[PDB]
Design a protein around this ligand. Structure first.
Ligand SMILES: [Mn+2]
Ligand SMILES: [Mn+2]
Ligand SMILES: [Mn+2]
Ligand SMILES: [Mn+2]
Ligand SMILES: [Mn+2]
Ligand SMILES: [Mn+2]
Ligand SMILES: [Mn+2]
Ligand code: NA
Length: 325
DNA sequence: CGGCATACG
DNA sequence: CGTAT
DNA sequence: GCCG
């Protein structure tokens, strides 16, 4: 079992769902308390279990697995023996965890804002609605649309959105292309939002594209909210006899950077963090969604494909469906 | 012990 | 500060 | 919280 998640296939569905979900509760709770290191360890331990070929049934099966020490092993031990982990259940039931989860799941509210509101005594969405003068426009939109945005987006919804985005992109710049990324590209059947990557085969023609796309979407009446190369929108998605608000992310990259942007925006989040960590710490190369930089030669790697990037890093290629770390 | 990914709006 | 994978 |  390799130590980095980018060194191992991780499928979307696996054989240790309950164990990984418990560890991810502790990771989330660590994040609400600002402990990014503990969050990462719990996330990595969770992902190791997702990568195993069969269920963990006995504690000895953890011996030698990376990222399982005293704490994560005890969590698993309790789940194996009693079906529940007291720490995990204590977190689940806590007022702090529930409220931080509720607040941070609002579009426009991060851990720092949620925590401040929590310390001020606020607990519910109606508590936030009562004093809208304290809210940003982004948070007002997140709060107004919160119910719709908590409803899973279905792959059937995605095809519809892709069609309307392509229509606007085709008018903004003939020849430009739209690629579905994010969790749906990794094979998820449901998601919290839809992620699209836009480019054009002639380097430089994509310059200025996103404002032109946004203006055309807004003119078709499809944009309930938007704030460049990244656009975090709320779309109006037609529904049977009505519609619902859906979060959509639109990203533009020049074709030279497209493989890096595709790789980054396809995720998972943990997979990309681990991949960038591996790149820097094991290979001495600096990776982001624009490129891969050798700081010794002071040069950027040219990539024509995700396969190129994996090869550059000395990693076996992983299709998106196996990047579900 | 230090590090923990790395961007853009 | 928020957002993204 | 865990690794190197
Ligand atoms: Mn502990
Ligand atoms: Mn016991
Ligand atoms: Mn997404
Ligand atoms: Mn997104
Ligand atoms: Mn850029
Ligand atoms: Mn330390
Ligand atoms: Mn996400
Ligand atoms: Na949020």
């Amino acid at each position: 079992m390799p130590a980095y998640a980018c060194q191992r296939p991780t499928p979307l569905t696996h054989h240790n769902t309950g164990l990984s979900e418990a560890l991810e509760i502790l990771a989330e709770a660590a994040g609400f308390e600002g402990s990014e290191g503990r969050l990462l360890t719990f996330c990595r331990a969770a992902s190791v279990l997702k990568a195993l070929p069969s269920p963990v049934t006995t504690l000895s099966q953890l011996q030698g697995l990376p990222h399982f020490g005293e704490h994560s092993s005890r969590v698993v031990q309790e789940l194996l023996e009693h079906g529940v982990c007291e720490e995990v259940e204590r977190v689940r039931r806590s007022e702090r965890y529930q409220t931080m989860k509720l607040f941070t799941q609002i579009f426009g509210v991060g851990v720092k804002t949620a925590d401040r509101w929590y310390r001020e005594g606020l607990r519910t969405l109606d508590d936030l609605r009562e004093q809208p003068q304290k809210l940003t426009q982004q948070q007002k939109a997140g709060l107004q649309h919160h119910q719709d945005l908590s409803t899973p987006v279905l792959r059937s919804d995605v095809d519809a959105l892709q069609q309307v985005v392509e229509e606007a992109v085709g008018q903004a710049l003939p020849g430009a292309t739209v690629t579905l990324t994010g969790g749906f590209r990794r094979g998820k059947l449901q998601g919290h939002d839809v992620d699209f990557l836009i480019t054009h085969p002639k380097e430089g023609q994509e310059a200025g594209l996103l404002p032109r796309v946004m203006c055309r979407l807004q003119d078709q009446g499809l944009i309930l909210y938007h704030q460049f190369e990244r656009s975090f929108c709320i779309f109006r998605l037609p529904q049977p006899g009505s519609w619902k608000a859906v979060r959509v992310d639109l990203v533009v990259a020049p074709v030279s950077q497209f493989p890096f942007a595709l790789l980054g925006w396809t995720g998972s989040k943990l997979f990309q963090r681990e991949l960038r960590r591996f790149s820097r710490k094991e290979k001495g190369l600096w990776l982001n969604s624009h490129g891969l930089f050798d700081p010794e030669q002071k040069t950027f790697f040219q990539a024509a494909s995700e396969e190129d990037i994996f090869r550059h890093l000395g990693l076996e290629y992983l299709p998106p469906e196996q990047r579900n770390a």
